[PDB]
Scaffold this active site. Structure first.
Site, short mmCIF file in Angstrom:
data_model
loop_
_atom_site.label_atom_id
_atom_site.label_comp_id
_atom_site.label_asym_id
_atom_site.label_seq_id
_atom_site.Cartn_x
_atom_site.Cartn_y
_atom_site.Cartn_z
N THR A 1 45.55 41.54 37.06
CA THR A 1 43.84 41.31 37.28
C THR A 1 43.27 40.86 36.32
O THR A 1 42.63 39.65 36.47
CB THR A 1 43.50 42.87 38.09
OG1 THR A 1 44.41 43.21 38.95
CG2 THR A 1 42.17 42.72 38.09
N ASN B 1 46.76 43.61 31.32
CA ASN B 1 45.69 44.43 31.59
C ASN B 1 45.84 45.93 30.41
O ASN B 1 44.89 46.38 30.25
CB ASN B 1 46.26 45.32 32.82
CG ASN B 1 45.48 44.55 33.99
OD1 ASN B 1 44.66 43.64 33.87
ND2 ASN B 1 46.03 45.07 35.25
N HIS C 1 48.63 48.44 46.82
CA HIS C 1 49.12 49.24 45.87
C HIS C 1 49.58 50.56 46.54
O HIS C 1 50.78 50.91 46.36
CB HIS C 1 48.50 49.63 44.51
CG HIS C 1 48.36 48.52 43.46
ND1 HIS C 1 49.19 48.24 42.71
CD2 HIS C 1 47.30 47.92 43.05
CE1 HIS C 1 48.73 47.30 41.85
NE2 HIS C 1 47.67 47.07 42.15
N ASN D 1 56.30 26.27 16.68
CA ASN D 1 55.42 27.27 16.49
C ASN D 1 54.70 27.82 17.93
O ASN D 1 53.98 28.60 18.03
CB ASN D 1 54.21 26.88 15.74
CG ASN D 1 53.52 25.72 16.11
OD1 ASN D 1 53.72 25.15 17.20
ND2 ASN D 1 52.40 25.45 15.46
N1 LIG Z 1 45.43 45.32 39.74
S1 LIG Z 1 45.18 46.52 39.11
O1 LIG Z 1 44.93 46.43 37.84
O2 LIG Z 1 46.42 47.64 39.07
C1 LIG Z 1 43.85 47.30 39.86
C2 LIG Z 1 43.21 48.47 39.01
C3 LIG Z 1 41.92 49.15 39.82
N2 LIG Z 1 40.73 48.09 39.69
C4 LIG Z 1 39.55 48.23 39.15
O3 LIG Z 1 39.32 48.86 38.57
C5 LIG Z 1 38.60 47.00 39.51
C6 LIG Z 1 38.90 45.87 38.39
C7 LIG Z 1 37.66 45.22 38.08
C8 LIG Z 1 36.93 45.99 38.62
C9 LIG Z 1 36.95 47.26 39.07
C10 LIG Z 1 35.34 45.24 38.37
N3 LIG Z 1 35.65 43.85 38.09
C11 LIG Z 1 34.79 43.06 37.82
O4 LIG Z 1 33.77 43.24 38.13
C12 LIG Z 1 35.08 41.50 37.21
C13 LIG Z 1 34.95 40.48 37.95
C14 LIG Z 1 35.36 39.11 37.36
O5 LIG Z 1 35.07 38.23 37.88
C15 LIG Z 1 35.30 36.79 37.21
C16 LIG Z 1 35.04 35.88 38.06
C17 LIG Z 1 34.96 34.42 37.30
C18 LIG Z 1 34.68 33.12 38.33
O6 LIG Z 1 35.92 33.33 39.53
C19 LIG Z 1 35.87 34.57 40.00
C20 LIG Z 1 36.21 35.73 39.14
N4 LIG Z 1 35.55 39.30 36.00
C21 LIG Z 1 36.11 40.57 35.39
C22 LIG Z 1 36.68 40.41 33.84
C23 LIG Z 1 37.43 39.34 33.43
C24 LIG Z 1 36.09 39.11 33.07
C25 LIG Z 1 35.71 41.52 35.87
C26 LIG Z 1 37.37 43.79 37.66
C27 LIG Z 1 41.38 46.80 40.55
C28 LIG Z 1 42.55 46.12 39.82
CA LIG Z 2 43.89 42.07 40.69
CA LIG Z 3 53.72 23.19 18.29
CL LIG Z 4 49.87 44.32 31.08
ZN LIG Z 5 46.50 45.43 41.46
#
Ligand SMILES: NS(=O)(=O)C1CCN(C(=O)C2CC3=C(C2)CN(C(=O)c2cc(OCC4CCOCC4)nc(C4CC4)c2)C3)CC1
Ligand SMILES: [Ca+2]
Ligand SMILES: [Ca+2]
Ligand SMILES: [Cl-]
Ligand SMILES: [Zn+2]
Ligand SMILES: *[C@@H]1O[C@H](CO)[C@@H](O[C@@H]2O[C@H](CO)[C@@H](O[C@@H]3O[C@H](CO[C@H]4O[C@H](CO[C@H]5O[C@H](CO)[C@@H](O)[C@H](O)[C@@H]5O)[C@@H](O)[C@H](O[C@H]5O[C@H](CO)[C@@H](O)[C@H](O)[C@@H]5O[C@H]5O[C@H](CO)[C@@H](O)[C@H](O)[C@@H]5O)[C@@H]4O)[C@@H](O)[C@H](O[C@H]4O[C@H](CO)[C@@H](O)[C@H](O)[C@@H]4O[C@H]4O[C@H](CO)[C@@H](O)[C@H](O)[C@@H]4O)[C@@H]3O)[C@H](O)[C@H]2NC(C)=O)[C@H](O)[C@H]1NC(C)=O
Ligand SMILES: NS(=O)(=O)C1CCN(C(=O)C2CC3=C(C2)CN(C(=O)c2cc(OCC4CCOCC4)nc(C4CC4)c2)C3)CC1
Ligand SMILES: [K+]
Ligand code: NA
Length: 805
Positions: A160, A181, A266, A686
């Protein structure tokens, strides 16, 4: 840290700037920092009467307690429920309207550019678009009427935060720094986790994400992140209220994020029957947004991107591999576990800890072993997963549908889950979605699959921004766009080639290896001279010579069957180019050309390899870039044994290379109606994905100046219309390429004791590559001289042949 939460959010609800400790906060992220004013819920998270207008509420007097409004003033206030005009003014839901081409932005006066709304869906697997189509009508309208890909490839690891931050920055995780993560940074001596506060520290987050790029260039960005407890309906209503702000405060870019369908995936697996409802719910949220835009007369104004971070696989805890079954020392290691593994020493004070013994103990130990260990520099180069101190030296690539864990207690915990993700980014289950809808996207257009690293550039193009330096290939997605395409120029050639003629006599050489050239007519004598002057070069260099984009000294060498750009510095070709027709015959190596190499009288002995060094190096042998097996005539076969076509090869690698050259090239020519092949060495000691300079090379052939490549590449090009031969193609091209690791053993291939026909292809598939990967690794620029659009060529350079069904 402590906050004064005594103050008020009145007239501040979802304010667009994040106020510091002297105040309490009212922005969409305040809850995640426990910093909201005491009255945030009361004032900003209203819920009374739900999210929908009903007939009875039409023309109500405004009551400020309601979650949303159905009062006559709501449109100008920008806070109607999203169904207000359907219920109260006889309008249709957006999803029930026929699609109509959006040829120009149809925006209210004062809009300086179409807004961009990015709608991200966590764990939204590519195949949901077809499989869920009956329950997602709004999404299906976006998909069919706008621009869509059949899937979009995430970055490795298919987790994620790495993917969300790649969408934000255009960077590989190794570059942006969010490599997992969970992470340990040994420089900071700090740990990053999903749970907890460390992840909020700015030092983790490299590159320049879209919201910063926008702000630095004067484009106002919507607060992108939503605290998890804010309901989706409120996030939608908030975006619509922001879009109703005055010209000088209204953002031009907005983000919505959904934790679904990943949360249910999940628990239930990607296609669990429980999955239907989350898909319906996400579609309803899309419909609220579109209906709400339609009410504000913005549904033909905004560009909407519907994108996921990664897919979801079936993974149940019975499919777990435990390192305690392999390692006697299992308590001396730290494992980052799951759908990938990363291993380091538990203590840096343990002098016994030895990575080589760990790797050995993990290699091909059980018949159906469901992970493979790698030193990170040995990972497939397409993963771009090594050049960060947060990536442990030892990596475990886990088979799809499995987990790795340190001990069986740890897993009792993946038995309460049925889905997961993180695997190799070419795995079909990990693929995700892309749809673009709006004035700047094309109408009812399907585009080929592409990588998520490309999107940042496109989001910049949509907003009029100059992207920060990133790993996209800007212009390779121009085919998604009606307008605001980016039209780059080919990079300028930095080193021009020499074209040496015959300058050296045979006796000037002391190769230690020399073929006994026994064979000795003017019809053929002038023919051999014309071939050396380049008379067949149009056949073998189909797309122009590659351009060298760095300062060096090299020679173009022409031959009957192949042409090469020979480096005087590295003592071998940078590239060798040749075309094999569908009719070409394979031959074996004659006795007058066994175990020997011929001086090239165009190239000085001082700039040539020699055979004595290979004799003296008991670990290193040699092969050939142009395959002698495919020589056109017995006279031309001599050219294949020039010292200028030789390259250092470990005997273990020679098995791979010979099978490629003797078996696979002809098979591909037969399947594809001819192929053009360009092959060469790569030096990446590298492991940064970039061409090494001469001072970075760590290994030479014993007692010599001959550098040893880390990898060998080939780029295999043919006509996309396979009814035309590769050398007479009128239209678009087709390509597949590889970057094979130049290893002294085949420990990677657990079946390598068998014949090559049972394992070499499987290896090559894992090490499939984009042309653009090769370009980074070599400082070469290919496809300089085609009939094709440069943007079509950039698309071709980003293609990856994945071999998935
Ligand atoms: N798979 S897992 O990990 O087992 C599972 C565990 C439970 N879980 C959570 O707790 C979610 C994870 C998450 C939350 C709550 C809120 N959240 C954002 O608000 C967010 C949006 C974004 O959006 C970035 C956009 C950029 C332009 O393109 C679209 C995405 N970016 C970033 C951070 C990287 C900076 C953050 C990301 C879901 C995943
Ligand atoms: Ca995800
Ligand atoms: Ca190189
Ligand atoms: Cl990881
Ligand atoms: Zn997930
Ligand atoms: C994918 O795309 C990316 C982006 O184009 C490519 O990555 C770039 O690759 C370049 C070559 O490896 C690399 O150039 C470095 O830059 C060094 C300066 O780096 C710091 O500052 C960067 C710019 O910051 C400012 O501008 C941006 C503009 O948007 C703003 O947002 C910033 O806020 C600033 O205003 C900054 O990007 C960079 O970030 C890295 O490091 C951070 C920690 O501080 C991390 O948070 C962040 O994630 C970045 O980490 C990645 O990159 C570093 C390598 O920099 C790497 O180690 C990490 O693992 C991770 O991968 C920095 O903050 C500059 O000092 C380097 O100069 C040496 O080499 C040159 C070659 O020309 C020499 O000529 C020069 O003399 C110099 O030598 C001296 O220093 C040597 C090294 O220590 C020393 O041994 C020697 O003896 C000399 O004294 C070099 O220019 C870019 O930094 C890098 N950018 C990013 C974002 O990663 C990537 O290659 C592409 N991948 C592929 C496969 O194509
Ligand atoms: N809720 S969450 O999604 O876990 C949370 C993740 C962290 N986050 C950030 O803004 C980081 C901090 C920072 C980024 C991204 C870019 N630069 C500085 C807020 C959203
Ligand atoms: K040898
Ligand atoms: Na093996």
């Amino acid at each position: 840290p402590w906050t004064a939460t005594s103050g008020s959010c009145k007239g501040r609800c979802f304010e667009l700037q994040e106020v510091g400790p002297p105040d309490c906060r009212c922005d969409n992220l305040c809850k995640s920092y426990s910093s909201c004013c005491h009255d945030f819920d009361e004032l900003c998270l209203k819920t009374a009467r739900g999210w929908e207008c009903t007939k009875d509420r039409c023309g109500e007097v405004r009551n400020e307690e309601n979650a949303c409004h159905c009062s006559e003033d709501c449109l100008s206030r920008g806070d109607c429920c999203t169904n207000y005009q359907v219920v109260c003014k006889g309008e249709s839901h957006w999803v029930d309207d026929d699609c109509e081409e959006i040829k120009v932005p149809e925006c209210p006066a004062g809009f300086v550019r179409p807004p961009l709304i990015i709608f991200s869906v966590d764990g939204f697997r590519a195949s949901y678009m077809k499989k869920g189509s009956k329950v997602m009508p709004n999404i299906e309208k976006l998909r069919s009427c706008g621009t869509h890909a059949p899937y979009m490839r995430p970055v490795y690891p298919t987790k994620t935060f790495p993917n969300l931050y790649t969408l934000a920055t255009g960077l590989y995780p190794e570059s942006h720094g969010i490599v997992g993560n969970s992470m340990y940074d040994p420089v900071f001596d700090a740990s990053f986790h999903l749970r907890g506060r460390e992840k909020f520290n700015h030092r983790w987050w490299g590159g320049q994400p879209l919201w910063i790029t926008a702000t630095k260039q004067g484009v106002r960005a919507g607060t992108f992140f939503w605290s998890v407890s804010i309901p989706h309906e409120r996030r939608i209503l908030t975006i619509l209220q922001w879009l109703s702000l005055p010209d000088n405060e209204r953002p031009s870019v907005y983000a919505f994020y959904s934790e679904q369908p990943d949360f249910s995936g999940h628990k239930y697996g990607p296609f669990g029957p429980e999955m239907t409802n989350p898909l319906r719910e996400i579609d309803k949220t899309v419909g609220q947004l579109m209906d709400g835009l339609k009410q504000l007369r913005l549904h033909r104004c905004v560009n909407v991107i519907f994108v996921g971070d990664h897919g979801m696989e079936d993974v149940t805890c019975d499919r777990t591999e435990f390192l305690s079954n392999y390692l006697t020392n299992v308590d001396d290691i730290t494992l980052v576990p799951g759908t990938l593994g990363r291993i380091r020493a538990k203590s840096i004070n343990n002098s016994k800890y030895d990575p080589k013994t760990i790797i050995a103990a993990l290699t091909c130990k059980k018949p159906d072993q469901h992970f493979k260990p790698y030193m990170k520099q040995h990972l497939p180069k397409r993963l771009h997963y090594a050049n960060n101190r947060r990536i442990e030296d030892i990596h475990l690539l886990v088979d799809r549908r499995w987990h790795v864990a340190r001990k069986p207690l740890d897993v009792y915990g993946k038995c309460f889950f049925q889905g997961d993700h993180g695997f190799d980014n070419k795995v079909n289950s990990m693929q995700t979605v892309f749809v673009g809808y709006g004035p700047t996207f094309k109408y009812r257009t399907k585009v080929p699959p592409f990588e998520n690293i490309e999107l940042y550039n496109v989001m910049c193009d949509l907003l009029g921004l100059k992207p920060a330096p990133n790993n996209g290939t800007h212009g390779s997605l121009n085919h998604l766009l009606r307008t605001n395409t980016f039209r780059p120029t080919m990079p300028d050639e930095v080193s021009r080639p020499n074209y040496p003629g015959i300058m050296y006599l045979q006796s000037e050489f002391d190769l230690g290896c020399t073929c006994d050239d026994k064979v000795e007519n003017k019809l053929e004598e002038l023919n051999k001279r014309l071939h050396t002057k380049g008379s067949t070069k149009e056949r073998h260099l189909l797309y122009g010579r590659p351009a060298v984009l760095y300062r060096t000294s090299y020679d173009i060498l022409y031959h009957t069957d192949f042409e090469s750009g020979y480096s005087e510095i590295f003592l071998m070709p940078l590239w060798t180019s040749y075309t094999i027709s569908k009719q070409a015959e394979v031959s074996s190596i004659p006795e007058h050309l066994t175990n020997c190499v011929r001086p090239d009288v165009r190239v000085s002995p001082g700039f040539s390899q020699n055979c004595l060094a290979y004799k003296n190096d008991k670990q290193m042998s040699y092969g050939f870039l142009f395959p002698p097996y495919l020589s056109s005539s017995p006279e031309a076969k001599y050219d294949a044994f020039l010292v200028t076509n030789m390259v250092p090869m470990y005997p273990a690698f020679k098995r791979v290379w010979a099978y490629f050259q003797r078996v696979l090239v002809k098979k591909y020519a037969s399947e594809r109606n001819g192929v053009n092949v360009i092959s060469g060495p790569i030096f990446d000691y590298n492991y940064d994905g970039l061409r090494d300079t001469e001072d970075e090379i760590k290994q030479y052939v014993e007692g010599s100046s001959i550098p040893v490549p880390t990898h060998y590449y080939s780029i295999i090009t043919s006509c996309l219309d396979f009814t035309q031969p590769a050398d007479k193609c009128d239209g678009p091209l087709s390509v597949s390429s590889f970057i094979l690791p130049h290893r002294p053993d085949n420990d990677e291939s657990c079946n390598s004791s068998e014949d090559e026909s049972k394992w070499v292809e499987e290896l090559m598939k894992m090490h499939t590559a984009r042309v653009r990967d090769i370009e980074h690794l070599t400082g070469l620029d290919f496809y300089r001289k085609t009939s094709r659009s440069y943007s079509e060529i950039l698309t071709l350079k980003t293609y990856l042949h994945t071999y998935e069904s």
